Ligand binder design. Structure first.
Ligand SMILES: NC(=O)c1ccc[n+]([C@@H]2O[C@H](COP(=O)([O-])OP(=O)(O)OC[C@H]3O[C@@H](n4cnc5c(N)ncnc54)[C@H](O)[C@@H]3O)[C@@H](O)[C@H]2O)c1
Ligand SMILES: NC(=O)c1ccc[n+]([C@@H]2O[C@H](COP(=O)([O-])OP(=O)(O)OC[C@H]3O[C@@H](n4cnc5c(N)ncnc54)[C@H](O)[C@@H]3O)[C@@H](O)[C@H]2O)c1
Ligand SMILES: NC(=O)c1ccc[n+]([C@@H]2O[C@H](COP(=O)([O-])OP(=O)(O)OC[C@H]3O[C@@H](n4cnc5c(N)ncnc54)[C@H](O)[C@@H]3O)[C@@H](O)[C@H]2O)c1
Ligand SMILES: NC(=O)c1ccc[n+]([C@@H]2O[C@H](COP(=O)([O-])OP(=O)(O)OC[C@H]3O[C@@H](n4cnc5c(N)ncnc54)[C@H](O)[C@@H]3O)[C@@H](O)[C@H]2O)c1
Lengths: 334, 334, 334, 334
């Protein structure tokens, strides 16, 4: 139904596409990137991380074709030159990683979009939503530049409000052992971040993250209670959040675990999941959910300090969320 | 000066040997392993992680020759056939990972040895020592079979000691993002631990650790206050401990890093090091210290909860304490 | 239909079990390994390389259950104790890597089986066969202990047969850039081959291969015209064969490739494949054929020296051929 | 002694520096890069492949201070605004990887430099030289923009010269299993080459090379007689060349090895190396020669078709050649 256009057909841009391939409620009609249609078609069809695209992929001049549907390929390095209105695009997915400041994202509105979704933490955005935590706070007539936050945050928010609603978080620290992304370097090179300037596939890399405190944007009640860091390791995909929290109540591992298992099958069904199996990162490559609790890992100390570990496919889970936000936003009418 | 024997010329036994080549107080007169002399000489000469040994290594007859000294090479799969007494070996390093029970390790004393150092946490050992934390409690009369603990406990114990001495640890949880070891599997194959059964270089593999609990064998007060887990990632060496604790008194990062820094410059010098550089895992490959504090990563929340991330080369650092402890043992009188 | 047994539920074993799930002609009734039903069930459904099994895996007693079919699990380290006869097993896939000698594998025939397929190069086998090259030389009366050869010989035979019957080979060299396997070490350790002693995921490891000379066993007139080498690199699966051969006839790239493509579409369909695409190794992960010609790599020098580069999933393509061989054997008579 | 300037302090630039510190004949006085001084003083000191620089690296304003000596750090993206003359730079190493064409690399000459060495193959350069095979063809009067070829041509030519002079190379094909470099992608992303567009640390990536055709530039005797390709694989540094050629004469494995060894000890000492140890790639990380023969791999079929394998540290070997070339040029009187 709703027509979508993607700006930056990259790891998140093509996976959002693959995700949207299914959902007939939305319709990807155009993509924009610095590459040629012939390159974008190849990278869309063969993925080193998720395999082959099961669909018919081809080029019609300078236009993509996938299962009959022809997709428009644009190449404006400047969003203002996009002409969304012309082609009739309603919602635009801003996944270049270059336009997360309102000042660059709003161009899409001026060019004729109705709404804009930023697949990363934005600046001066109208609102930040984590499907499962605050999508209910989306005002159609007031919010147009929308941020879907970061993958880590989408992973941590769901199980944080659940421990908070039932036991109440006093404070907590989080680490994310995360897979390397295209923002790091193959071999040693310059990066605004001297950590990320180091060969990504050779070391464990300490780095910062805004995910933990940015949780207060979706769950205000937790403002100033969390903080955290990250560590990039030698795997191309899949991450795991590690949270240690000081609880307001005395629990047992069996209590902390039943809570999450309840919400995962209840309120949070489809976004939050639960597992009692001893799985490893490769096992989660393809997981469309945001957060998967590893029950075998839950621990409690003195009945008041808890450790909850949760998995998350940083490209797929996150890619299915962008598409879920698109449809939600859409259903509220543009 | 005092003769030493190495049982199990593995990552740990060869590494302790390199360390020991530069220690005037000890002297490795013989090594026992299932492998032959050529193989052992080649693996001693070329190391994929630590590089080529700066020494002249050869195989004369059945014995290794290193810089003139001739090392005795055995192949007795049974500790009591070793005859350490015949050659006059006083301290025997047990690094096969098979003899971790006092009784099994006691077999070296049977054979002529006076002291046995197990390069691993043990079962009913005489005393467990973490250089810098409790080697003072070593009695030359009552203790014969000593455990040097694990590489993780050696990294955590020293800074927990300082945080508890200065601020007081109410309780804490830990996580060691550890490199893979020989105990893991190249590709999916049988294994006691179903997590460790999976390909080591392919995934982020959550697993267990006794390190956190084991701290108490060296730091009594913290009994029941620490706990933690392990995450083995695709790096071949160098690991990192991540401690999140609730302190007694309200601290600030400045206080936390200052107390650590000071302890690193005095009492704990040589064992505990402090770094304010934005470094990564490859950088500590070859460190002799048991724990280098990542000061840039220190953080606190609500003035009572801190996070302290520390580095430790698992092979080299630990190897240097085995040699350290053995020489401390030799000084106490045998 | 045919009842089948597997000895050694490892990399080839579990993969042959997965391939046989498609085959109608055979049926795997019992498996034997050192690992128990519970571990065997886990590793079966969860694979770091091939994914989650898309079937229902359950365990009952010491048996497995996949899609309602109870499979029998044994743990006889000695082959003559399996008793294939009491359970109707006609075919036995020898994949432990231990019983390659005709005299050991023959233990299965002493157990009640009628045919044994050794998943590897053999010593004294009745006949060695590469499907598509010489399956026709199989005599159901004379051959009981068949060698299916190596994954490398299966990749190389099919197009060496074409190049030879087509243009004529005089002499050639081959190198297989190959993924690491379970015969190597995670971290620097003892091994008969001092090259396979080095940390597998860390280096480019040169090693020997008999795959070149083994091709004369099934392509007789190629006796002494070939030889080659191997180089294990840091990828968990999928390999490539690089063949430089001097021909009898003058040729051109265009002709060399036309000859391969034709066979891929006629003669060797299912065994041989042709690729015009600039894909990489991870893209062939799951390829069922034995060899896919990277047609973009074919080269000619002085119109007599050729270079053909073929890809092959060492685990998948091989396994399917094990299933095929089994089904063929059953078709000629049993 | 001879003042040298580096344009582009990347992988080859930083290494060329490190090597330069050993030679007093040259003195690196200036370096140009897009990255800041503080970022360069970090990447220089800490290296994920080659470890820490054994030196005092400091920052002064926006210049480097290394072992007392201050280096002027420039930041001009355009080579014509570099002013190499105002600072006394005689020789300029062009290692940005973007100025491989005369019209661009000439700008340094117009800017004040006397000689230019391009750290890669070039187009329309005054002359292309591989040390030890044709540096005598240098004309200090006619040659100013000098190409130092690639790391591969550097490895392959000196021994190709030996084999050809000695036995006679009718024709031959080559393959270089090569470590990944900074021209690749960490994760599937746009690239001119769709092979290099794929996730670098995850696959075997067949790619192109001109190395084979380039030998002819330095050994015209071998024009149209060689050709080859590249296999980029998941290691961070150190590569290997696999040459398979035809000979006019009939040799034996010993016949060929005696000659490579002889050459290594005679005419080609320092440039070519010979080895009888079963080493692996990490064993060559740090090597300063351009070519080390894996003598355990020489193969001969019929006495006419030979296979020779040679290792090469692509970063270090090449950079010591660059420093060397800068010494020869100077030696002739700029
Ligand atoms: N990779 C992950 O796991 C992940 C997950 C969630 C969010 N994100 C966020 O998604 C955004 C994109 O990240 P990515 O990981 O996909 O990186 P990426 O490099 O794959 O994607 C960038 C895409 O943007 C294109 N591009 C950049 N500027 C362009 C321009 N001006 N015009 C046209 N095309 C342009 C690039 O060609 C590329 O194809 C970032 O904000 C990132 O923080 C990444
Ligand atoms: N490697 C590290 O990162 C690390 C750190 C600290 C402690 N440890 C502990 O050190 C011990 C050894 O571990 P490692 O990591 O070096 O493993 P490893 O597998 O490299 O070494 C085992 C050595 O003992 C040999 N061996 C086995 N049985 C023997 C026998 N019966 N007689 C003589 N020699 C025999 C093996 O061949 C091998 O050389 C274990 O207890 C381990 O848990 C490991
Ligand atoms: N993986 C490949 O690429 C590949 C390809 C072709 C041929 N092969 C060959 O087939 C054989 C299997 O190799 P793999 O790669 O599957 O190895 P693997 O290590 O994954 O499997 C070996 C298995 O045999 C079991 N086993 C060993 N001895 C046993 C015994 N005596 N009784 C019962 N079970 C036993 C082990 O528990 C293990 O699961 C080897 O000969 C190998 O060289 C492997
Ligand atoms: N990596 C090796 O093994 C190797 C070996 C032989 C030849 N080469 C060639 O050497 C050259 C350098 O390759 P690399 O591997 O060092 O890559 P690199 O990216 O690590 O280094 C290139 C440096 O030049 C800088 N640079 C780019 N444009 C610049 C500009 N306009 N002005 C100033 N500085 C600029 C970049 O920021 C970077 O630091 C390339 O031609 C490469 O192909 C590399």
């Amino acid at each position: 139904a709703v027509k979508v256009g993607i700006n930056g057909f990259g790891r998140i841009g093509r996976n959002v596409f693959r995700a949207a391939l299914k959902n007939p409620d939305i319709e990807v009609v155009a993509v924009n990137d610095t590459g040629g249609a012939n390159t974008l078609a190849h990278l869309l069809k063969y993925d080193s991380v998720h395999g082959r695209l099961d669909a018919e992929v081809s080029v019609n001049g300078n236009n993509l074709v996938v299962n009959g549907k022809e997709i428009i390929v644009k190449a404006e390095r400047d969003p203002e030159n996009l002409a969304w209105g012309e082609i009739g695009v309603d919602i635009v997915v801003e996944s270049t990683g270059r336009f997360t400041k309102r000042e660059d994202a709003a161009k899409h509105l001026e060019a004729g979009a109705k709404k804009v979704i930023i697949s990363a933490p934005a600046k001066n955005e109208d609102i930040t939503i984590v499907m499962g935590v605050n999508q209910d706070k989306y005002d159609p007539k007031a919010h147009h530049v929308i941020s879907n936050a970061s993958c880590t945050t989408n992973c941590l928010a769901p199980f944080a409000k659940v421990l908070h609603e039932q036991f109440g978080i006093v404070r907590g620290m989080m680490t994310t052992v995360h897979s390397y992304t295209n923002d790091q370097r193959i071999l040693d090179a310059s990066h605004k971040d001297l950590r990320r300037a180091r060969a990504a596939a050779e070391s464990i890399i300490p780095t910062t993250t805004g995910a933990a405190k940015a949780v207060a944007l979706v769950l205000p009640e937790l403002k100033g209670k969390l903080n955290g860091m990250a560590m990039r390791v030698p795997t191309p995909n899949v991450s795991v959040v590690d949270l240690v929290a000081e609880l307001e109540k005395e629990v047992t591992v069996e209590e902390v675990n039943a809570a999450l298992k309840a919400a995962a099958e209840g309120e949070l069904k489809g976004i939050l999941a639960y597992s009692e199996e001893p799985l490893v990162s490769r096992d989660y490559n393809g997981s469309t959910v945001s957060s998967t609790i590893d029950a075998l890992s839950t621990m409690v100390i003195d009945g008041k300090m808890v450790k909850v570990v949760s998995w998350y496919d940083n490209e797929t889970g996150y890619s299915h969320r962008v598409v879920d936000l698109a449809a939600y936003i859409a259903s509220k009418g543009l």
